[PDB]
Amino acid sequence: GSIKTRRIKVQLVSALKKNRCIPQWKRACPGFKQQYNFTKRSWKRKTLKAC
Amino acid sequence: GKVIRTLRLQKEHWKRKHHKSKGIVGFPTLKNCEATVEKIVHESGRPAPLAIINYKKEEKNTKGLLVAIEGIYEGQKIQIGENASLELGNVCPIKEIPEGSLVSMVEKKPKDGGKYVKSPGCYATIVYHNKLTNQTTIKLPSGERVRVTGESRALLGIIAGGGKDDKPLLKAVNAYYKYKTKGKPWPRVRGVAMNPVDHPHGGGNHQHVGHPTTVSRNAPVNGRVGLVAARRTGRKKGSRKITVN
Amino acid sequence: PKLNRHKASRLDKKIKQKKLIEKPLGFSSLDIIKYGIGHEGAAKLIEEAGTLTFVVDQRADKINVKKAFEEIYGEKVKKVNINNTMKGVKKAYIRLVELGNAAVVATKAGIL
Amino acid sequence: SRKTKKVGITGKYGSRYGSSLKRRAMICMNAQSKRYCCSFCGKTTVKREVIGIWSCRFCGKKVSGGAYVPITNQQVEYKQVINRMKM
Amino acid sequence: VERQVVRRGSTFNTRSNKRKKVRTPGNRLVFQDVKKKGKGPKCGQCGIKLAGVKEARPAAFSRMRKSCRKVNRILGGVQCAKCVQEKVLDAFLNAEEKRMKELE
RNA sequence: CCUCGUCAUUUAAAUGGUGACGCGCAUGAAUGGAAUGACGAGAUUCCCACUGUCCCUACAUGUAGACUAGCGAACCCAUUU
RNA sequence: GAGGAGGAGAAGGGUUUCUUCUCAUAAGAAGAGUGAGCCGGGUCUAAGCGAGUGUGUAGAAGCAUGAGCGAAGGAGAAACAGGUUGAUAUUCCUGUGCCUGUGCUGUCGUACGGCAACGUGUAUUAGCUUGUCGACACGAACAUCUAGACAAAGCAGAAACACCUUUUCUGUUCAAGGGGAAAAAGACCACUGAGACGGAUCAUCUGGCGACGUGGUUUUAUAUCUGUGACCAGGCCUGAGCCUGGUUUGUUGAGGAUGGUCGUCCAUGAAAAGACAACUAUAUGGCAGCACAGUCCGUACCAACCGUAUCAGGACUCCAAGGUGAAGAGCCUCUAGUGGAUGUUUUACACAUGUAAGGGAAUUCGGCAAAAUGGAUGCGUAACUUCGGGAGAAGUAUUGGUUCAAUUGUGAACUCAUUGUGACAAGGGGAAUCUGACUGUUUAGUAAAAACAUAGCUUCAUGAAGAGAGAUGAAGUGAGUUCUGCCCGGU
RNA sequence: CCUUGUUGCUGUGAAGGCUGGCGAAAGCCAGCUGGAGGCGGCAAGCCGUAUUGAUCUGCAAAUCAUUGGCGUAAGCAGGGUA
Ligand SMILES: [Zn+2]
Ligand SMILES: [Zn+2]
């Protein structure tokens, strides 16, 4: 909801910046072997436990 | 089995709370005082009313609590200690009060603040003064006779609020309000209606105790239920009391 | 006294010691300001309300921002409002004592 | 007033609780609700605030008393004994 | 008929949350807040409310003029005219008995 | 227990109900005994009203079901029946 | 269908919100978006928790005292209208304000009046002490105010017209701050001097401790005015600006606010921070202008929450129109909001429902299920009973529309093709027996009961208390009425 | 245990009060006023008697329909604490 503590807000801000795919240029690099970022999440499928 | 109801209710988190209390009840310590009665008040757990008193100790005003005797009023001046007059509601040394008189809030030893008679409607009777030993015999409301030294103080009158037990509580809710502040279990479920894990009277295909209900004084605590160390039982007449002053 | 401090608004706690050598200039005007923001959202504010918008260091407060602007850019300030955004950036909005000067300072500084 | 032959103030309870118990309660219930005479001002304006405390609606004096009546039987007698001690 | 929302705070209808309905120049019906009522001084002897003094809440009372908070007599607010008449007489009459008991 | 005890009343007809009787396998007095009022989604018998419960079944309505487009599983299984 | 499938907050979720593009779609990718001295947190204290210290333990636990902590719905200085974005707004912009402090310049101050009830005067710090405010249960009736809703007249625009109609619909606005009545309800002051008697309430009641009367003093709302104009409706033109209105009266009325009364209780219904008055000393203090200051954290959105989900379940609160009727009941409408596995007339057996000749429980363990009765007004009401009840006992009759009398009691006439609480809503009743006195409670998920509880009755132990025999604990029986015989051999 | 929220419409008509009549008294009989109660019929709600109804590869690891019980109170509920 609208009321939040400072500690809860920083957790949300960090959880929101980490939630991104692999940038499209990295895929062209000779040494790079990852397909998809397995740390990506959806609000419909997991809980953060920020509480 | 498990621990019985009687033990659980004696643990510390079940003791009566004091948050609504007015203060500790008892006489001032000084040899002589003149006091004024400031207010007469009800205290949440107690049926007898309390009186707030005001008296000087050095230059400063100080406050105390007495149990109210019947017939005081707000604004009355009262006299405490040696050289007080025999007037209703004064406090005096016991040796000054004549035989056959009725007293309340009696000290068992000097400067204890007053114990003995403190419940609504009660009083004690002065039955004898011994001029050699300086003892006095008082008859307590249980019928017991006890000896106290002449230097102890006492309040002249009967405790306010008498007659309260005349009116029956006809309903369950009326009993609820009376026991809400006491330590006894209400409502009280009978032991014969429990299972044998919960109470020594539990179990069986008919509701019965099955063993005698009179138990020893030295029996172990988690089974000491029923009539503890009874001398006799039943509705028959007893015997003559033996009496000395 | 030790407590978990979960309801607190300031995340720092400890009082700070002296040191044998101290850092040259300290928390100072050129650490406080990061950049002015110039886009279609900001442009309206310069044109209508005489206010600039800036990104500022997390450690900064209203009094410090007021001083730093008057030191770097030179116009006098009426008000400062502050906003912690969902992207982890502290924004400051500064209104100038005379309007019109907002378009002068913005253009000199290359914000606009 | 007095529209009932026997039941008096206890008519509020209908047919519930026993007959014998109601006629004990009745004595106390009639006594509680009355106004009584003030010792200080003579008027009939004294009523009960709470058990043991009685109060005058004109002059404001408060006095200790019984649970259902201002002066109890033991008090009416004992008050006299004290007056004799003063002689 | 237009219906309202709570603009600020909580919906939970406690003593600190009284509201009234008001019509604005723009022809809207809106809720607006209400401050609690104040009780003024009662006499220290008898419980009667003192004449000549205003009733307000502690913060608002302190911002009024001193004349709103007293009467010009021996006890300002504090006590009523009858109780001071009694006090003045009592102190006089007691001193006269002491005078007599000293002279006799 | 014997037992569907005997006598009366209720029905055309009563292993039922109510009233009587009592050597009661093995009733009974705060392990509480006995007679009523008001109040039970408590257990039991009868009468009046009422009816597809029944004699004895018939017709009609909505929604599923049969057939059709799109989508699309599971229990179970030595199997030749 | 206003106890909404409407509009908003809390707990919980965390970008789900806005724009663009692509299908990959309850799918992705890239950007953008939350602004405060006056709203809430950071303060105070409840029940309570506790570092350290003392005592104890192999170390612990525990016990005594006690810094600090403990409520986003208890106490708690000061703000409101109207505008603006794709997305924020009592936070931004315009206007008018307020609280707490700081500094400059002017301008005044060092006291009086009334028999009194008390008034005039915007007034400094500091301290004892005494008191007040903060600061408080439930229930009932009666006043007064404000939202709201009606009805007439005026104007502006709409709807409807084969016929009829001045028929019908929508509008007619005024914030915080400043100034301010009459009224009603209570206190009190001066004169006066009252009864087998006057005054007064819906109801209690009230007076020589001073009635009625005649003149005053004070406490508590609201209407009205200002708030410098905003905002709305309509017309003319238009890639813009002008012009015209926003006027009067009556009835009712809270599910909000306030006031003084009355009732109930073996139940009498928080603290503290922070304030104020009197008394005593001490005095360069009041007001007007102008200027300066007020840090830190939260602020988007939810039909998106918990149940493995896009789940008929669960989940704390606020606002609330017209008719019918006793009634935020059911039924019907205005404001605001809403919807998809496709076609086919589709047997039998189902699941939700209707109706039935003659008979009327013959059915079945058993009237299980269904039918019948139903609101208001009147007449008339038994055994038994703790005299309160039983009791709506039972049993019977009336009820629509129209046009009149009469004024709360109701009467009378005329009229209709099955009759009238016409739909919706809405008791079946009596005679007996067993059992528990009554309202209440229980096996969340096969048992709601005769079981548990309960008021009352009886027994037992104690003079120890932060409690003191009308007390504090332990057992048994189960309201009331009427009784409660005999046995101490065994344990 | 501490701090809070939540009662709308109706029936019956106790205590107390005022008039009129009857009586030598004591105190009896009418009509009106007043509004008590773990008191009656209902609403919002809280619950769980029957159909041994529907469902039993469920909408659901306890739900749905009609029918029922209480509803001015030993009633229901949020947060803090034990
Ligand atoms: Zn008096
Ligand atoms: Zn006074």
Side-chain angles (χ1 to χ4, degrees):
Chain A
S2 301
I3 301 158
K4 295 166 212 186
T5 72
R6 189 56 186 167
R7 264 176 199 187
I8 289 163
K9 194 183 183 187
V10 298
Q11 292 173 75
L12 303 179
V13 169
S14 47
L16 189 61
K17 290 196 275 189
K18 289 178 186 176
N19 205 36
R20 189 192 170 205
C21 66
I22 302 171
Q24 191 57 10
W25 60 267
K26 291 205 78 176
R27 271 161 181 148
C29 296
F32 183 85
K33 285 287 298 179
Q34 303 183 20
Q35 294 300 345
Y36 70 90
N37 175 12
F38 58 60
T39 72
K40 199 166 175 69
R41 60 159 186 96
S42 169
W43 60 277
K44 300 175 113 166
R45 284 172 171 189
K46 177 175 157 81
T47 60
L48 280 169
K49 293 218 287 185
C51 301
Chain B
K2 295 189 81 182
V3 178
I4 68 168
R5 180 186 69 219
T6 302
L7 287 194
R8 295 204 279 113
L9 261 43
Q10 289 177 341
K11 289 216 166 189
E12 296 299 275
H13 55 271
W14 287 97
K15 260 71 195 202
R16 290 188 201 195
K17 296 168 173 278
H18 291 301
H19 63 265
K20 288 181 186 177
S21 177
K22 252 69 180 177
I24 305 300
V25 175
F27 289 150
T29 285
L30 309 178
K31 179 181 173 181
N32 324 84
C33 313
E34 178 180 297
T36 181
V37 171
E38 296 210 319
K39 289 176 295 299
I40 303 166
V41 280
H42 179 76
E43 181 257 278
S44 186
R46 184 189 310 264
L50 299 174
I52 291 166
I53 57 154
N54 170 5
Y55 67 100
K56 284 179 197 293
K57 184 195 285 173
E58 301 182 310
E59 292 75 33
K60 305 293 300 163
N61 291 327
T62 64
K63 296 204 189 206
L65 275 172
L66 306 176
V67 194
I69 60 96
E70 189 173 318
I72 69 180
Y73 58 92
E74 291 181 344
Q76 183 180 133
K77 308 297 296 289
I78 69 167
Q79 198 167 16
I80 290 158
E82 193 180 42
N83 305 113
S85 66
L86 291 177
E87 287 173 73
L88 187 77
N90 279 343
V91 177
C92 316
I94 195 166
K95 60 183 181 177
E96 303 293 346
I97 310 166
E99 282 188 16
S101 299
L102 305 187
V103 295
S104 66
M105 214 175 145
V106 175
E107 295 190 307
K108 82 153 297 164
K109 58 193 83 179
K111 298 182 188 175
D112 74 18
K115 291 163 171 61
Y116 295 139
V117 172
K118 292 202 270 170
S119 294
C122 297
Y123 53 84
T125 305
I126 300 179
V127 303
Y128 187 62
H129 293 120
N130 192 326
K131 290 293 185 178
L132 273 174
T133 57
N134 200 40
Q135 298 282 15
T136 302
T137 311
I138 75 166
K139 173 183 169 182
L140 289 173
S142 65
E144 183 170 321
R145 283 174 149 76
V146 66
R147 279 186 290 172
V148 294
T149 59
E151 283 190 338
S152 56
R153 289 165 305 168
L155 188 63
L156 199 51
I158 302 163
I159 299 279
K164 97 192 182 310
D165 288 343
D166 277 12
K167 177 179 166 156
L169 302 161
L170 309 161
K171 286 154 83 184
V173 77
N174 285 352
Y176 170 82
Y177 295 122
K178 193 178 167 191
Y179 303 120
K180 190 182 152 61
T181 59
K182 293 178 186 198
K184 61 153 76 57
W186 188 98
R188 144 114 50 168
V189 184
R190 279 149 43 241
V192 288
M194 309 190 183
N195 294 303
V197 61
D198 291 320
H199 199 269
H201 298 172
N205 287 310
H206 298 291
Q207 276 187 10
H208 85 298
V209 187
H211 55 84
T213 50
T214 62
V215 297
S216 177
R217 170 147 267 139
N218 297 139
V221 94
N222 196 68
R224 205 197 291 158
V225 298
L227 310 169
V228 180
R231 286 163 189 93
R232 51 166 304 281
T233 194
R235 214 191 66 84
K236 176 171 79 190
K237 184 179 180 181
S239 64
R240 283 178 75 155
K241 62 178 89 176
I242 305 289
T243 305
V244 63
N245 293 317
Chain C
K2 295 224 263 189
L3 51 89
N4 191 54
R5 227 164 163 275
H6 48 259
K7 291 173 185 185
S9 58
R10 284 188 180 185
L11 312 165
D12 58 353
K13 186 198 86 168
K14 277 170 207 147
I15 179 68
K16 294 191 186 180
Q17 290 180 47
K18 285 182 179 180
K19 286 174 182 180
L20 182 62
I21 315 290
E22 294 195 70
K23 189 192 167 183
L25 295 182
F27 196 58
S28 54
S29 61
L30 291 166
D31 204 9
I32 287 148
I33 308 297
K34 290 174 180 184
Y35 47 90
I37 307 160
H39 71 334
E40 299 192 313
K44 290 180 190 177
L45 292 178
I46 296 166
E47 285 183 324
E48 295 190 321
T51 182
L52 307 156
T53 182
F54 284 92
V55 172
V56 298
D57 195 21
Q58 196 70 219
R59 291 173 297 165
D61 303 302
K62 278 179 190 180
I63 305 99
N64 304 46
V65 176
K66 196 160 167 181
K67 290 180 176 184
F69 182 86
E70 289 186 354
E71 178 162 293
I72 297 170
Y73 298 101
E75 307 300 330
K76 291 193 177 180
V77 172
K78 189 185 178 180
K79 282 212 290 172
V80 185
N81 283 146
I82 289 187
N83 171 21
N84 291 298
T85 62
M86 270 310 281
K87 297 190 179 174
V89 161
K90 185 173 266 169
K91 287 203 278 196
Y93 306 87
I94 308 175
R95 196 171 156 148
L96 306 181
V97 171
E98 293 177 62
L99 321 165
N101 290 39
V104 174
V105 65
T107 53
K108 183 178 180 180
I111 293 162
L112 177 71
Chain D
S1 308
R2 299 170 175 89
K3 302 172 193 75
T4 53
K5 294 178 177 181
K6 280 185 178 180
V7 118
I9 190 165
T10 70
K12 60 164 75 174
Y13 298 134
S15 282
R16 307 176 288 280
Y17 341 112
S19 192
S20 305
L21 290 191
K22 284 188 279 184
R23 74 184 72 180
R24 298 211 297 247
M26 197 188 304
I27 312 299
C28 306
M29 283 169 68
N30 282 138
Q32 276 173 254
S33 60
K34 272 177 60 174
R35 293 180 169 206
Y36 296 92
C37 195
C38 188
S39 287
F40 303 101
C41 72
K43 299 170 161 66
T44 46
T45 53
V46 171
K47 296 196 82 169
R48 183 176 167 272
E49 297 192 359
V50 55
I51 172 172
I53 307 175
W54 292 82
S55 188
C56 180
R57 290 189 166 195
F58 181 81
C59 72
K61 292 279 196 168
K62 291 204 191 193
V63 197
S64 310
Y68 308 120
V69 292
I71 330 290
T72 64
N73 294 311
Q74 286 179 350
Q75 185 64 11
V76 177
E77 289 184 318
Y78 187 59
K79 192 166 185 178
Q80 294 301 319
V81 178
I82 295 161
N83 298 341
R84 296 167 207 145
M85 293 197 288
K86 290 179 194 178
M87 305 302 289
Chain E
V1 184
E2 191 172 345
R3 300 176 274 187
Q4 281 75 207
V5 289
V6 176
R7 334 256 295 279
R8 288 174 170 166
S10 191
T11 56
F12 278 108
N13 203 17
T14 52
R15 278 190 287 198
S16 308
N17 269 299
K18 289 181 278 186
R19 306 178 220 287
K20 64 180 274 180
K21 290 174 200 166
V22 64
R23 206 150 201 109
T24 71
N27 204 5
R28 297 160 195 154
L29 187 64
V30 304
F31 263 150
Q32 193 146 294
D33 301 328
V34 174
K35 294 193 176 179
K36 277 143 81 179
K37 266 198 89 174
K39 288 186 186 183
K42 66 180 179 186
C43 175
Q45 280 289 324
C46 70
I48 290 165
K49 280 196 183 184
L50 301 179
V53 290
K54 297 301 190 180
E55 300 201 277
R57 292 209 62 92
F61 198 51
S62 303
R63 296 192 306 258
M64 295 175 186
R65 288 167 69 165
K66 194 164 158 62
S67 74
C68 304
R69 302 198 289 261
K70 59 153 180 171
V71 180
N72 290 320
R73 216 190 292 111
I74 185 69
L75 308 163
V78 202
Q79 298 205 7
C80 66
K82 264 188 191 170
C83 296
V84 292
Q85 178 179 282
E86 282 192 326
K87 275 202 161 200
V88 164
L89 279 165
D90 188 37
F92 176 86
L93 291 172
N94 280 277
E96 292 312 294
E97 178 180 312
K98 289 173 183 178
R99 177 193 173 197
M100 270 39 183
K101 285 179 170 168
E102 183 182 55
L103 289 168
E104 292 185 314

